[PDB]
Design a protein around this ligand. Sequence first.
Ligand SMILES: CCCCCCCCCCCCCCSCC(=O)O
Length: 269
Amino acid sequence: MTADLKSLAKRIYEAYLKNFNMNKVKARVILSGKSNNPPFVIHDMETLCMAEKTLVAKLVANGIQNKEAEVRIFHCCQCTSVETVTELTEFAKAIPGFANLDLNDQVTLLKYGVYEAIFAMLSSVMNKDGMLVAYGNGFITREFLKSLRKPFCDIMEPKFDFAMKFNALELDDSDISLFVAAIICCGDRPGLLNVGHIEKMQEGIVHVLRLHLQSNHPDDIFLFPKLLQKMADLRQLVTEHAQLVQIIKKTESDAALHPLLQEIYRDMY
Ligand SMILES: CCCCCCCCCCCCCCSCC(=O)O
């Protein structure tokens, strides 16, 4: 790894640590039970409702006008995505050539990349039993999410399935930061104006990723192609997620979609 490419990997990593509220080290410290403001455990309806009253009090301050639990949970899912979209938009500036792209191309890349990146990074807050939520202040169990009424019980399980395998690769955030940058730099997204420049930007970050994995994971000679496959798997996970969100939109009148997320989904797949 030349000084320039090692430096670029470090730049990316530092931008990740700055711009994401959650990183894998921070998540592991919490998940280990290692303590001021430890996470509320949400494993059933009683504990969901207690957690809501402390952590999202406005959402349950409406008396009997409060929405159904599953709809409140989905609203909190969406708020989490909106916040992660903001973080990803600032992170993207650290990627060589991204800020030099036409504004419309930056929008297109973020539109198609954000959910892939969201689900990749969600792995860092997931273990086989549950996941961190609410800025690290809740732990919601995988079984509780599976217990929700249909269709809401179908949202998170495929993301756990992705995450258990992704986490078995034992990436750290120096790896994950470059993987997220590579997700954002896909030249095959629909509607790009300057494909060739995006392809060169992609090639550059993927080269940095390949060299970084070779150095940081000398034990796994397949790690780079494994991650290329994970990117394809994410694209599929997102297509399926968008299909479920469309079902919710059509059949669940109380589950209002945030306008930023509606725009991301519009004409996506
Ligand atoms: C009191 C706390 C309740 C916590 C539930 C929070 C679960 C948020 C994590 C991500 C959800 C997945 C986002 C995809 S689902 C919404 C979307 O499509 O953006």
